């Protein structure tokens, strides 16, 4: 099953963008659709010869051929489909076409993890917690020039140079140079503090509401 | 009773700010304090000759007199104290003091009025609550050029030609035109949630006891 495989992704919220491949031109449309634009090569120019529209909750996907399955030429926005489609869903898909979902599926996680859903300025750094949630990125831009980037396998650490490392287990945190273990203590207090800010503010997105509650910025630079 | 007249004033979250008259210069300092200066002029300069230094929070005033009472020039920041000082808790300051107390008091609340708490986006309108709590100013920015603006005694509407008009009683609320009723609604409805949020990113401030969780910018003008 390909839900066993991967999730449904979302675009709920994620801002427009386009990402052009050797394999595909990826794009989150305005309308939070993902569109998956399989160009082919006939030098010079490249047509879109298949397209996978996929719903921003990620189970409808509509595969087409434009130009009767001849080709158009690469543009700034995907050719809009005509009656002539074949349509699935999500639980549906033929595996014929697994592959390039994920192609989509992958490219909205990414774009998740740098898309900001909470921004908290504290007293020393900028936090700001991503949105490929659960286990989202969580940045901290210290402001006396120190970054840290937390993530779900490792957190990265950037001094004010550009030393450079990348910690993994705890037993190499501790190990870390002593005056760090508290920018950690800081960072960590951010991520719990925007996830937990995260938790309350959902609650009231379930509610009745008008707009969505995210993204928040909470204050400002001092 | 002072405590009749104001509350005292509360500074917390606002941005640094001078104001001058003739006779005083208030400021809001980097640290949230509140400074009333009192000025006399002298040969074409004015100097300093009396200072309020009033607490964030309101409740603690220090008073003294630069130079020996006879006065510093008026500067961009006010004179810092010297050992000679007095100073009262608000609720234990002389009368003699209190008309200067309220011009630090007025001018904080106006400042509140125009700052914002929480300013949130909907698909129609801009919302933003202001700082004067409680029932503090609630402003909304409808994107197709209509103003509503929800004040304590009074509700303000200005339709997209300039049409304002003060609602007081629910008598003038009801008789509302009935697409404007629309707005209204809306508006009501930006007030409620704005509130509702309020309260519960308050509530977990509370607890956190770090950097402030206000104000907050939540979503994006589409
Ligand atoms: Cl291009
Ligand atoms: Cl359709
Ligand atoms: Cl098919
Ligand atoms: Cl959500
Ligand atoms: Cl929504
Ligand atoms: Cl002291």
């Known amino acids: 099953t390909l839900r066993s495989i991967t999730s449904p992704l979302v675009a709920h919220r994620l801002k427009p963008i386009r990402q052009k491949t050797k394999k595909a031109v990826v794009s ?3 309308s939070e659709e993902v569109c998956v634009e399989l160009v082919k090569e006939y030098a010079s ?5 298949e397209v996978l529209q996929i719903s921003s909750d990620g189970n409808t996907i509509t ?5 009767g399955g001849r080709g158009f030429p690469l543009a700034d926005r995907p050719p809009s489909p005509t009656d002539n489609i074949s349509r699935y869903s999500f639980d549906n898909l033929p595996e014929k076409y697994w592959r390039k979902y994920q192609y989509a599926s992958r490219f909205v ?4 993890s740098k898309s900001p859903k909470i921004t908290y300025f504290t007293r020393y750094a900028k936090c700001i917690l991503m949105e490929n949630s659960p286990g989202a990125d969580f940045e901290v831009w210290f402001y006396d020039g120190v970054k840290i980037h937390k993530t779900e396998d490792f957190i990265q650490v950037i001094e004010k140079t550009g030393k450079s490392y990348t910690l993994k287990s705890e037993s190499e945190v501790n190990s870390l140079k002593e005056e760090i273990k508290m ?4 960072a960590n207090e951010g991520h719990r503090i925007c996830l937990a800010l995260e938790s309350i503010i959902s609650e009231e ?3 009745t509401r008008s707009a969505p509650f995210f993204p928040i910025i909470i204050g400002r630079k001092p």
Do not use: G
């Open 183 to 186: 920018y950690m203590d800081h």
């Open 28 to 30: 989150i449309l305005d």
């Open 63 to 67: 595969i087409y051929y434009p130009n």
């Open 205 to 207: 997105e379930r509610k």
């Open 45 to 49: 120019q490249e047509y879109v010869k």
């Open 109 to 112: 996680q990414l774009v998740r």
